[PDB]
């Protein structure tokens with residue numbers, strides 16, 4: 068054994084031992100219980116960043132822990148390789164996006180192998196390869212046949228200068244980004260997943276996920292936005308039919324989730340495109356201007372709640388079918404023409420938005436809900452104005468006194484009798500548009516034929532191959548200009564036809580890749596049933612909260628689609644879910660300087676020029692402030708184990724991790740100490756059989772150390788398995804070593820206990836720093852570490868020794884105050900001096916007066 072810790076020595080050899088042993092290359096082995104630990108696979112955008120290293124070390128700790136508990140553990144990796152990164156690099160460097168990701172793949176793959184993650188590289192996928200995306204094309208056509216995917220016209224943001232479609236985030240103040248020209252909204256045919264059909268199943272199944280963090284389930288429910296409310300029809304007043312045609316001359320229909328407050332509607336509001344809006348806007352020019360100002364506007368959800376609510380009166384009127392009030396119809400910029408009806412009611416007394424609107428315009432407010440003896444101020448919104456649970460109706464005539472749900476059922480009753488109303492479920496969830504006017508993406512398997520329409524490619528012809536020898540210019544979609552690509556035959560009639568040229572939302576790959584890992588070379592379908600039956604569902608998923616909504620929702624949706632196709636039998640893909648916290652680092656600068664390029668003394672200056680540089684604040688490692696710390700700088704300088712140890716110890720996984728030079732140093736020093744402990748131990752005796760069995764007759768000191776050992780093993784087992792707090796687990800192992808350091812392990816029995824401590828410590832840290840632990844282990848013991856398995860808790864080591872003057876009794880050391888006092892009134896010498904308060908002094912006397 069060398070005296071000095073050399074990570075650059077032992078880390079490649081350990082990996083080679085693990086590789087040669089093929090401990091991570093696993094099959095569908097019924098001779099072992101399966102465990103599927105999955106980390107969110109990366110975009111091959113170039114190199115790894117500290118976020119990758121944190122995410123994948125967390126998954127590897129969990130994987131290795133289950134491995135040492137004998138599970139058949141699959142920890143797969145692969146490349147989410149479609150998207151804009153490559154397309155952008157293709158413009159920047161005149162290289163094909165394929166060639167640019169593959170170069171990133173083989174680099175990041177050796178970068179990951181370098182870190183020693185216990186990963187089944189035989190299960191590696193790359194989503195940008197035909198043998199992968201052919202299967203999402205296949206499912207696309209299957210669902211397109213059933214109408215679960217359909218074609219309809221949707222609006223997009225067209226930049227008439229950059230000449231492509233822009234995302235609703237890449238538009239700034241109504242204009243483009245790299246062009247900044249006035250966006251043209253254009254109606255183009257597009258493909259959708261009918262995810263609304265699965266809304267209720269996606270909502271209700273969340274309850275099955277007892278091991279998901281509730282916030283993620285909460286975020287998923289709010290995005291689906293189920294509501295149980297009422298459709299309500301308002302008779303258009305006789306004087307207000309001027310210009311109204313058809314069923315819009317008859318009634319204004321709105322949706323509401325507070326029909327219990329229908330007696331409080333003081334006006335109504337219609338979208339800019341509403342027939343009543345435009346029928347009023349004929350002879351009134353200022354309404355036509357308002358309608359145009361609304362049309363020329365963003366529709367971003369974030370822009371909507373942070374928007375000055377604006378309305379205009381119309382002079383048209385409708386009648387509330389409950390109390391006969393005459394209510395003016397306003398046009399308002401918060402009403403959207405597409406979400407159910409194009410119009411809402413407004414109850415300012417019990418809806419804050421309606422309250423601020425009515426306070427701006429001096430519109431009336433009618434309190435119809437009261438909450439106990441709560442005073443009500445018409446010029447002061449308070450939280451209880453919107454109480455759906457602790458309210459009963461007031462100023463509502465024959466509806467006074469009912470709670471929400473009783474008044475709900477009564478208003479439904481009253482409205483249905485008149486026919487003017489019916490209950491209705493609604494969801495904010497829209498359908499999932501998957502078409503992208505982009506090159507580097509899965510081609511959409513549809514061929515357009517003038518005779519046969521939009522026909523899907525037969526399963527025999529799949530894949531529709533994306534040509535890789537392309538360098539997109541950003542001035543269009545190169546597929547739509549490649550006749551050698553889009554020109555084809557019709558599969559139904561054999562005549563001239565053109566392929567679809569849009570590609571798919573790259574969320575499509577990440578929506579089913581966890582199943583493909585079960586059989587990534589299977590050629591007869593998405594996933595062989597043999598592997599799907601064995602692996603079932605992902606036992607543990609690890610990723611960032613940036614995917615808690617859309618990616619998880621799409622992954623769950625694809626699971627239930629794939630189930631309903633009979634490809635899998637699970638309903639939900641991820642049982643356990645762990646959200647990694649982000650990694651932050653200080654920034655340095657008008658001109659942001661990578662920290663490794665900086666000499667930071669109290670002060671801080673450049674690394675080259677040596678001139679004073681500005682030490683700015685601390686934030687997520689990014690490119691916007693050039694504070695990403697390349698983990699390759701970390702591995703070269705301290706080894707992989709120091710890197711993994713630093714991030715697992717710096718903070719709990721869910722919490723943000725602050726980069727720290729002294730932190731990495733400490734991690735490396737602790738590994739240096741762990742190395743020296745074993746070396747010093749073997750220098751004065753060499754290996755011996757670890758202590759085991761009855762510990763009676765061990766000295767008090769060695770007994771305590773065995774107590775500290777097996778209590779540590781229980782707490783590290785708990786921190787790995789249930790709490791998933793790896794920082795406290797590492798702390799506990801440091802506490803054991805500290806007590807060991809203070810324990811005279813010189814005797815024969817002392818060396819046996821010392822051997823027990825060390826053999827447990829290296830196995831307890833192996834999930835975090837396996838390179839040094841694998842090395843130290845084989846220097847302590849000749850068996851395979853993975854075959855010796857996770858250390859067991861010796862519960863005997865946890866039982867600590869037991870503790871007129873009438874007599875003396877023996878009680879336990881962890882006894883109760885009633886435990887000692889109970890034996891006092893049953894002692895022989897006690898009853899002899901008692902003849903039919905009890906001052907119990909723990910550790911001395913228990914006198915009974």
Ligand SMILES: CC(C)C[C@H](N)C(=O)O
Nearest residue numbers: 107108109110147577618
């Ligand atoms: C699960 C995937 C959506 C993860 C994604 N490829 C990422 O690197 O963030």
Ligand SMILES: [Mg+2]
Nearest residue numbers: 275276277278
């Ligand atoms: Mg269950």
Ligand SMILES: [Zn+2]
Nearest residue numbers: 516519557560
């Ligand atoms: Zn045809």
